């Protein structure tokens, strides 16, 4: 490091004091083949670091800083940078990155029109040396990579010829070919007009296919990578080449003993599967239920299925009794490809893979035995479950013994297959023939290696839902097929939870997910155990937080938040289904977990909304005696309301305040002052998402409805706030803003309503307090008048406008009617609500009409 400061900032007191002078002197020591290869690259690295960055915004800002330098300085920079190509005889070169750095800034503003025709010239020139054509193709590659293809469309055919000339078989240097073939990979986007003409297309494909035959494997892989890209970009043009060329190339590639070549051949067909599944959806959806496709599938994968499958299953043998993950070898690639083929080819996949399975499931060589159970599991999704069920039956007890195989990788594959069966086709599991022995097999599996046990946890989760939905899924069933095993499965899962190697293969987290999954998916006769289990889960997840929160990685944090989020839903599940007295029993512990989930967790998260939703559930079940938790919940409710960033949390918290209003009623008064301040602040903060404001306006009514005359403190500011919100205008030719206008109107009307009702009282006649809102009645009805003549209002707005008219009649009487008949548009609105298909708008408009009638008769 001792010579680092004298460099890594000695070259920064220049780049900020005088960046022009800096970049010019660096380019000089780059352009001269006399200085060290180290200083040369350092210079180039300094220039490149001055023009671009991984952060798209500082890149966008480093570019503007370049387009600000004196044009004579930059032209000096561009002169030495460009004149370096061919001079460097080391590494891929540093100048090529400088070319593209500058170019990505200057090209989109038409500031270096000289570059591209000059770069084409470097490759095209027959005098040009190896290093000249090589470095130039690389720069071309970097440019096409880092720039928008829309900014190169007029030079596209110049770029292409330079690349093709580098890829041609005649070119003696494979280094050039590799550089050119890599360049083509980044420039297939703007050769669209070429590929569209047949004779033009033929030549491109010829060069690429020819390049896959190059005795250099780098050129092979690169060209094979191009074929994968070409299939995605120009799928509708490969019928010509698949037969005579593309089949043989990729097929032979899959069989290569060079892993890099094999992975590209496999990726070709995996990619075809992705295209042809996406077409299978386009042909299925919108199509037929609208006009038919519109991009038809040529079914390349279906058609090659008979020569792909035997190659793949053989590749499933080529494994490591070790590997670690994520290891990406042809063996693991072959399995994923087979899976994609099954979901793409469906039933057609079955008779090609089945003779392999039935011939190797008992082979003494473990790599062949592993491959068989693996191939079996790969095809379980896609084919009809009809054809599939009597087939796992053959293999099920074989799967069960394979769980106790002497090879660790067969054991692991068997468990994945079982778990895959339990999720996709649990018929073989939830069956009187194999259920009990499979459970024993699973119970034993939790004691196995973490890689196996995690798969078992998965299988348990899938079995619990399958069992729950199977007779006899609200309302809850009295018993299910896991009832006589429930307490045993739970304690086995809890044992797994406390394993010293629980950190491996997400074992511990998977078991916690299984636990919560069986708690949710359980029958009524499991409830005493469900209740205890729920308590245990909460105590231990608390321990995990208190003891491990500070040492969790980014991935541990995503899992733990996922589990806490799951715990919330689990707690909501339990609290809604158990006897009310039992919910009271555990509600103290439930509240503690939820309160621990707030903003402490997490840095990357969090789960505040999930937790607020669980509190809402506890509020709805307890209601009034939730009051005991109100003092402890207060700060966390406050956190939710101040979370304008995560606006979804804000919404849930605001909604929760309304739920607390209906539950605690007048008991919420001690807590209203702070809540009202928070809500009011949220309104006077333009950094808040607009979707929370109407919900806040609504809750004003809920709060007023709960505390009655105590709301007088807030009347002035609230009523005036409602006045500005009611006067809102938007562009009527902006459907999003019109929908937001209606949402705001509906909440304004709701707010007025709850304030009128809340100040009125429940008894008769009206409390004097309501008279404080009377001066607003004319504006309120004037507000409804404008809504009436807007035509773009919704039936949800008409409903609330009607409900308010009915409430004003009861509160203020005769005065309301004089104001209403002076605005005949109001009666138009009430009629529209009276003649409505919306049940809420028809009742309220009728009620409002009735009340208006009484006022007239009472005159």
């Amino acid at each position: 490091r001792l010579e680092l400061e004298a460099a890594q900032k000695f070259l920064e007191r220049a780049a900020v004091e005088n960046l022009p002078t800096f970049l010019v002197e660096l380019s000089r020591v780059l352009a001269n083949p006399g200085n060290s290869q180290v200083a040369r690259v350092a210079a180039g690295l300094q220039i490149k670091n001055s023009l671009t960055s991984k952060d798209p915004d500082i890149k966008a800002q480093y570019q503007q800083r370049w387009l600000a330098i004196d044009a004579n300085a930059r032209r000096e920079v561009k002169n030495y940078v460009l004149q370096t190509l061919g001079t460097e005889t080391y590494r891929p070169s540093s100048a090529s990155q400088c070319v593209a750095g500058i170019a990505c800034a200057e090209i989109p503003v038409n500031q270096w029109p000289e570059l591209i025709p000059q770069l084409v010239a470097n490759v095209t020139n027959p005098n040009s040396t190896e290093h000249m054509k090589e470095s130039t193709l690389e720069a071309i590659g970097y440019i096409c990579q880092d720039i928008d293809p829309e900014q190169l469309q007029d030079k596209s055919n110049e770029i292409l010829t330079a690349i093709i000339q580098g890829m041609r078989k005649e070119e003696p240097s494979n280094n050039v070919k590799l550089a050119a073939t890599n360049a083509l990979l980044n420039s297939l986007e703007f050769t669209k007009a070429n590929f569209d003409k047949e004779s033009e297309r033929h030549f491109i494909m010829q060069v690429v296919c020819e390049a896959t035959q190059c005795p250099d494997t780098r050129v092979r892989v690169a060209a094979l990578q191009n074929l994968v890209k070409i299939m995605s970009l120009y799928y509708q043009y490969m019928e010509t080449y698949m037969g005579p060329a593309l089949f043989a190339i990729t097929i032979e590639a899959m069989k290569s003993d060079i892993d890099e070549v094999a992975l590209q051949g496999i990726e070709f067909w995996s990619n075809v599967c992705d295209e042809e599944m996406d077409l299978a959806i386009e042909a299925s959806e919108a199509a037929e239920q609208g006009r038919p496709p519109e991009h038809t599938s040529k079914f390349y994968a279906k058609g090659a299925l008979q020569y792909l499958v035997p190659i793949l299953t053989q590749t499933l043998t080529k494994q490591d009794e070790n590997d670690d993950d994520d290891d990406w070898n042809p063996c693991k690639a072959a399995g994923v490809c087979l899976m994609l083929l099954a979901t793409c080819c469906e039933d057609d996949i079955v008779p090609h893979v089945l003779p392999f399975i039935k011939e190797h499931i008992k082979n003494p060589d473990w790599r062949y035995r592993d491959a068989a159970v693996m191939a079996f599991g790969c095809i379980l999704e896609g084919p009809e479950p009809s054809q599939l069920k009597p087939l796992v039956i053959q293999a099920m007890p074989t799967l069960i013994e394979l769980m106790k195989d002497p090879s660790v990788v067969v054991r692991d594959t068997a468990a994945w297959t079982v778990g895959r069966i339990c999720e996709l086709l649990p018929e073989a599991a939830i069956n009187d023939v194999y259920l009990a022995p499979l459970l024993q097999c699973l119970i034993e599996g939790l004691s196995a290696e973490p890689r196996v046990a995690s798969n078992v946890c998965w299988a348990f989760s899938s079995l619990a839902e399958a069992a729950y939905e199977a007779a006899d899924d609200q309302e809850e069933p009295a018993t299910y097929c896991l009832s006589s095993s429930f307490e045993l499965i739970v304690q086995k899962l809890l044992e797994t939870t406390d394993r010293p190697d629980g950190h491996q293969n997400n074992l511990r987290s998977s078991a916690y997910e299984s636990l919560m999954e069986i708690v949710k998916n359980s029958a009524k006769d499991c409830y005493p155990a469900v209740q205890k289990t729920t308590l245990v889960i909460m105590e231990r997840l608390q321990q995990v937080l208190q003891m491990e929160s500070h040492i969790q990685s980014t991935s541990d944090r995503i899992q733990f938040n996922d589990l806490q989020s799951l715990l919330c839903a689990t707690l909501q599940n339990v609290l809604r289904k158990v006897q009310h007295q039992d919910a009271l029993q555990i509600s103290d512990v439930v509240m503690a977990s939820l309160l621990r989930m707030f903003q402490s967790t997490a840095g990357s998260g969090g789960v505040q909304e999930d937790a607020l939703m669980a509190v809402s559930t506890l509020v709805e079940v307890l209601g009034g005696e939730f009051l005991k938790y109100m003092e402890a919940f207060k700060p966390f409710l406050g956190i939710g309301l101040k979370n304008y960033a995560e606006y979804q949390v804000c919404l849930a918290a605001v909604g929760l305040v309304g739920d607390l209003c209906r539950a605690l009623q007048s008991n919420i008064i001690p807590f209203c002052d702070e809540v009202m301040q928070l809500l009011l602040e949220n309104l006077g903060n333009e950094n808040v998402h607009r979707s929370v404001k109407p919900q806040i306006l609504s809750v004003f009514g809920d709060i007023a409805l709960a505390i009655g005359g105590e709301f007088k403190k807030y009347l002035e500011v609230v009523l005036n706030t409602l006045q500005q919100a009611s006067q809102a205008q938007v562009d009527k030719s902006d459907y999003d803003m019109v929908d937001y206008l209606n949402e705001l109107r509906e909440s304004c009307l709701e707010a007025y309503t709850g304030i009128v009702q809340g100040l009125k009282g429940d008894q008769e006649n009206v409390h004097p307090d309501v008279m404080l809102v009377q001066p607003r009645v004319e504006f309120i009805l004037s507000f409804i008048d404008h809504i009436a003549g807007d035509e773009d209002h919704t039936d949800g707005v008409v409903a609330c406008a009607a409900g308010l008219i009915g409430d004003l009649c009861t509160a203020f009487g005769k005065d309301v009617l004089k104001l209403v008949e002076a605005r005949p548009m109001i009666h138009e609105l009430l009629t529209e609500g009276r003649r409505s298909k919306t049940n809420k708008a028809k009742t309220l408009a009728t009620w409002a009409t009735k009340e208006l009638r009484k006022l007239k008769n009472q005159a």
Binding site: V228, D274, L425, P426
Partner: protein, 110 residues
Amino acid sequence: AFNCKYCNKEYLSLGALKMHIRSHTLPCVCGTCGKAFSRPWLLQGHVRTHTGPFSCPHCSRAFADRSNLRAHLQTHSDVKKYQCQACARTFSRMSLLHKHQESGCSGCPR
């Protein structure tokens, strides 16, 4: 002998029935695609994906179709794993990550 309590649309297999029922218990809806989820955390994981229709995890680039997205990903390097931002499980290709994510985080690799 299987049927959905939510809409009585009788099923013959219980795995397909299992997949059906899940679509009725999905309140958390997106706005960037209106895709649906069972938990708020799952929905949030989903929108982590949107750098904005379709986005590249590596470089944040957007494309008009999934084909050009797919072709673009071929240009990228070692990756390799696509990691779900809801459950941290990893995947070999983006099609398998998306399919996992949209089904409420179902399906474990290999």
